[PDB]
Amino acid sequence: MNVVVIGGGAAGLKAASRIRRKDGDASITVVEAGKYVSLGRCGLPYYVGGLVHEVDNLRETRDEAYFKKLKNIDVLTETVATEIDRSRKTVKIVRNGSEDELNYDYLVIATGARPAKPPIEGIEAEGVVTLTSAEEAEKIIEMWEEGAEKAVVIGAGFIGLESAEALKNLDMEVTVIEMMDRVAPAMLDREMAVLVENHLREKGVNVVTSTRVEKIVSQDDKVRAVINGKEYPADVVVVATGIKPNSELAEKAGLKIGETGAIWVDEYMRTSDESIYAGGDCVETTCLVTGKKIIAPFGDVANKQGRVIGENITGGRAVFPGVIRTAIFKVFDFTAASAGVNEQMAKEAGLDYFTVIAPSPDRAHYYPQANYIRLKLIVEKGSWRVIGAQGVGMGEVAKRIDVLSTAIQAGMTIDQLANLDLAYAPPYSPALDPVITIANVAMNKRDGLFEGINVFELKEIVILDVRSEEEFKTRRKVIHIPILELRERLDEIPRDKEIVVVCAIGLRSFEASRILKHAGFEKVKILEGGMAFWF
Amino acid sequence: MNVVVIGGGAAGLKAASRIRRKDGDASITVVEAGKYVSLGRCGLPYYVGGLVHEVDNLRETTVRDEAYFKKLKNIDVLTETVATEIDRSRKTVKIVRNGSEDELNYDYLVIATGARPAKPPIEGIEAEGVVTLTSAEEAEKIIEMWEEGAEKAVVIGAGFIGLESAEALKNLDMEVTVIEMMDRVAPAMLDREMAVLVENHLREKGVNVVTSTRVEKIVSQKVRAVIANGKEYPADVVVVATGIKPNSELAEKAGLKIGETGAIWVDEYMRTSDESIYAGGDCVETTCLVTGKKIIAPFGDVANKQGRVIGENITGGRAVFPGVIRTAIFKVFDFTAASAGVNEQMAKEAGLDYFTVIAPSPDRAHYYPQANYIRLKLIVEKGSWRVIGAQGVGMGEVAKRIDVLSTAIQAGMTIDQLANLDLAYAPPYSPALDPVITIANVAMNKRDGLFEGINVFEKEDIVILDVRSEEERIESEKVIHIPILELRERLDEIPRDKEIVVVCAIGLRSFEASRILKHAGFEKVKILEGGMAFWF
Ligand SMILES: Cc1cc2nc3c(=O)[nH]c(=O)nc-3n(C[C@H](O)[C@H](O)[C@H](O)COP(=O)(O)OP(=O)(O)OC[C@H]3O[C@@H](n4cnc5c(N)ncnc54)[C@H](O)[C@@H]3O)c2cc1C
Ligand SMILES: Cc1cc2nc3c(=O)[nH]c(=O)nc-3n(C[C@H](O)[C@H](O)[C@H](O)COP(=O)(O)OP(=O)(O)OC[C@H]3O[C@@H](n4cnc5c(N)ncnc54)[C@H](O)[C@@H]3O)c2cc1C
Ligand SMILES: CC(C)(COP(=O)(O)OP(=O)(O)OC[C@H]1O[C@@H](n2cnc3c(N)ncnc32)[C@H](O)[C@@H]1OP(=O)(O)O)[C@@H](O)C(=O)NCCC(=O)NCCS
Ligand SMILES: CC(C)(COP(=O)(O)OP(=O)(O)OC[C@H]1O[C@@H](n2cnc3c(N)ncnc32)[C@H](O)[C@@H]1OP(=O)(O)O)[C@@H](O)C(=O)NCCC(=O)NCCS
Ligand SMILES: [Ca+2]
Ligand SMILES: [Ca+2]
């Protein structure tokens, strides 16, 4: 048969490659609009930053010849598909300025997504870019070659912050302007995003939240951006404020657009027309924790979908049930990562939930280069199914979020979580993995064992520092009694007042809280996270 | 309530601690036969190897002795007190402390006596220089014999303890030999195809290894070990790492039930025959969850999980420990080796009909710096399509993929649901499709029959189709070289007569070669799953 696919990225070409494997004499035409094809855009930041030496490192082991000689896939570069005709099973295209028509039996719509442009003045001014194409990344390189030293990023998304770091590695002053309460809003709660935020500031990236941008001042077509009513010079601006899926070829063909604005498909990835599969960044998908439909615009999602499309055109049955939003990005020295549902979207899903956060050693506390990762876990009440997890930190958080991610897709309970046999040795984890121990911490709050509160809760009431050595401390109703000294002292403690137990990262806070309870104290609050989030 | 606990292993003191947090009034007494309470054994190798400066560190928080457990948890820890007999009718425990004999009254009793090292019945096994890494005493015995100038060593056992000892001892710039009776290093964890990698990294790091050899005698004056083939290996230190025995003897002497393994039997609640007697840690029988088999999982993580549930039910709860999956990990030099779930040998002895697949893949996006290629092996059950075991070895982050796959195995995931698993991907952390997702797809490619793959084990007429660019490789004998990007065209070269075995660097471009020829109708085309990596 002949298959025509509209794309050129992860989705398009993986779909193409799998159909080639299943059928060796199907006719596969991939229609692409740009010069480059199969480019590893999921790296462009690390190219700007210098980790990657040249852009062709993100297409390697890859021109049209590669796809011809290897897979016998005919890829037409710099050709636009301008209309789909489902009645004649045709795709009209433009090439060399002379139009033509491709006839298909199966068709892949894999058109990706474009950067959403905030409707504001000066957006098209020179020096305002997006990190969507090789070309735009390079332009950032030429303006730094030409004397650019100040940068504004709009948006603390993972693309935003990675272009923040990429740009600071160019020795530019970076300021990031975020619309929301905290940095990385899709992935994190305030509670946690504080950390990331302060790490950025500590690396010379300035970060301002809960502000829009009003205008982009341009001189001779340059820049400076008006925050709240402030100005932030800028020789470049990268706009990273979300995406908008390239679905209009699909809508103008009668294909069904779901409430995200993106092409609706089913589990099989077929679109409304049976002959017409679509997948990747242009397509809607289901959040399997809540079942709401969303756009999960990631590269792993794209390969997974594009393969299921490939398999189906070839006659098989394969499903892509949905996603859970497990994302991860890398900041200077911190990792941040998210799985399942966070507090805002757990709220908008109507789920009754409870929250617990417990940081833990990376590897054996005594082994060299052990770090403290900070995990927050969101558990659904009654069922006790775990519905979200998030992590930020200095050392190895990615593994904990991968395990908690597959735990959440398993619908595991904090009960069956706590006894998950994990791979432990002193260089890899402590005896009970951070994921284990926060399972236990969830059940100590659930079982009402301890009553627990976060750090935003500032009401300054007595705070007890069950610590022991102050090099970093808080100023003050601060009474200090070492945990080891507590069984004995305990006299200072007053009672009849709210005492909020506070240790270094909350372990000893727990072990005190229960000590006080035995004592007879009525109000004891343990500070989740501990001095881990005090800053 | 007063609760007694035999031994301050991990299990013993986590059990006691969990009780303490839920009951401030209970009397908790812990009896310990040795001087040191709560030492972290899992770190003694890295102590000997020098990563950890002081033995005492393995007992720190940022020294956690009886005064610690008294001042902080109001737990009465009795050091150097041996528990000699338990009597369930009397509900008492006889202790000998100070060469005097007393008794301990109890309402609930916890047995957490751990395991002693199994000692192979050999002549000279009690000579000087022969050690186990079971206690801080034996560990610093090693360090002092090196201080006195020992340079030759022999390890018996390619288990994790033995292997960690090989690296620790070689870090002292000694010449280290490992002798293991079975055909492969790390038998309980790995298969031969995988186990050879670990082996070869050991020899390329200068710890020499002899497999499929027994130890027959130890000579002395002060050591030297004669090995099978009567090969004699000089020795100035030997560590025996041959396995363990659960310290369950007071239990059967008290009439409690001993399981088929020799360890104390426990139910899911971690109780024994006597309900007043809970038992956990290295002395207890456990369930392997994929096969239902009864086993001994003498690991520190299972010890603490049990210890917590034990403490939870003494203190009026409902704790459950269903078993384990035998997910273990060790580090040898620049390599990491890990297993979860069932292994080939244990799968056939469990009688399950399964298939296997091997597919190495990059640590991170190939263009990102410090990408390594981990090797994953996946054992998937027939009919169900459940993933029942995985092994991974390599330089790079393998541990992540075995933690995720171990989770999938305990959740009963099939390769079909494994392929869709939403993981955390960004160029510095994984490639677009994580190695786990890729092996899932390669498995569904075996099950779907799209490729016939065979392992690193070939003397039959056949042409080895080599797709690669630079040959720096198999050398020869029926090898035809055609790089993959020219293969589409150059075909009347590959004789459409003989069985073809496509071999590439990692196994990936081979799959696209094998399918290319499938289109060409070659029929008798098979593939080397694993790639060039599994080769000598
Ligand atoms: C800077 C950056 C960093 C990223 N980092 C990550 C990350 O860390 N992790 C992650 O998971 N994801 C990341 N992504 C996202 C990832 O790139 C996308 O999810 C993935 O590229 C999806 O590709 P796709 O095939 O859906 O669309 P694309 O890869 O965008 O492919 C679009 C192609 O379609 C072609 N096209 C579109 N419409 C037409 C038409 N009408 N006619 C002809 N051709 C057309 C265009 O030529 C374009 O070549 C990142 C993206 C960017 C930009
Ligand atoms: C060198 C080494 C490295 C290891 N590495 C790892 C690893 O990397 N990963 C991993 O998962 N596991 C590892 N382990 C295993 C881990 O130590 C065990 O799983 C764990 O120690 C078992 O806990 P336990 O308390 O049951 O045993 P133990 O901690 O040994 O507790 C036994 C205690 O009971 C006391 N006792 C015993 N009998 C009596 C008696 N009759 N009277 C009084 N007291 C008694 C003994 O004094 C001892 O103090 C390692 C073990 C060793 C030795
Ligand atoms: C690679 C790309 C062109 C598709 O090419 P592909 O041939 O389909 O993908 P691979 O190179 O890994 O080979 C894929 C197949 O070989 C298989 N394979 C077989 N043995 C294997 C082995 N030992 N190891 C790895 N893969 C193996 C894989 O399972 C996969 O199987 P499948 O055909 O059933 O799907 C596409 O992913 C792309 O466009 N990448 C650039 C866009 C992108 O992802 N950007 C993100 C930037 S980080
Ligand atoms: C340390 C030991 C005695 C257990 O004592 P413990 O006080 O109960 O263990 P911890 O120090 O971790 O404190 C654990 C408690 O703090 C809880 N906790 C509460 N909030 C926490 C937080 N924010 N972070 C960490 N722990 C927290 C833990 O869940 C746990 O409570 P719980 O199990 O009752 O539900 C035992 O593990 C041991 O002997 N370790 C050495 C033996 C060993 O592990 N050897 C292997 C060498 S690596
Ligand atoms: Ca994802
Ligand atoms: Ca384990």
Residue numbers in the entry:
A (entry chain C): 1 to 61, 67 to 232, 234 to 466, 473 to 488, 493 to 551
B (entry chain D): 1 to 62, 66 to 224, 227 to 463, 470 to 483, 488 to 551
Q: What do the authors of the reporting publication say about this deposited model?
A:
Pyridine nucleotide disulfide oxidoreductases (PNDORs) are a large class of homodimeric NADH- and FAD-dependent enzymes that generally function to reduce small molecule substrates at a catalytic cysteine positioned at the si face of the isoalloxazine ring. The major structural difference between CoADR and Npsr is the addition of a ~100-amino acid rhodanese-like domain to the C-terminus of the Npsr. A surface-accessible cysteine in this domain serves as the initial sulfur-accepting site before a molecule of CoA bound to the FAD-containing domain chaperones the sulfur to the active site cysteine adjacent to FAD.
The 3.1 Å X-ray structure of AfNpsr reveals access to the tightly bound catalytic CoA, and the active site Cys 42 is restricted by a flexible loop (residues 60-66) that is not seen in the bacterial homologs from Shewanella loihica PV-4 and Bacillus anthracis. As expected, the enzyme is a dimer, with the N-terminal FAD-binding domain (residues 1-448) having nearly identical topology to related Npsr and CoADR proteins. Residues 449 through 550 make up the C-terminal rhodanese domain, which is linked to the FAD domain by a single amino acid chain. On all four AfNpsr subunits found in the asymmetric unit, two loops on the rhodanese domain comprising residues 465-472 and 483-488 were missing due to disorder. In AfNpsr, CoA is deeply buried, and in this configuration of the protein, CoA has little access to the solvent except for a small opening above the pantothenic acid arm. In AfNpsr, the seemingly low accessibility of CoA from the surface of the protein results from a larger loop consisting of residues 60-66 (TTYGAVR) that closes over the CoA binding pocket. It should be noted that for the dimer with the ordered loop, the average B-factor for the loop is 67 Å2 compared to 47 Å2 for the rest of the FAD-binding domain, suggesting there is some flexibility for the opening and closing of the loop over the enzyme-bound CoA. For NADP+, the phosphorylated 2′ hydroxyl group of ribose introduces steric clashes with E183, M184, and M185 as well as strong electrostatic repulsions with E183. A metal ion binding site is located 5.2 Å from FAD. Given that AfNpsr has all of the same catalytic components as the other Npsr and CoADR homologs and that none of these have any demonstrated metal dependence, it is likely that the bound metal ion in AfNpsr plays a structural role.
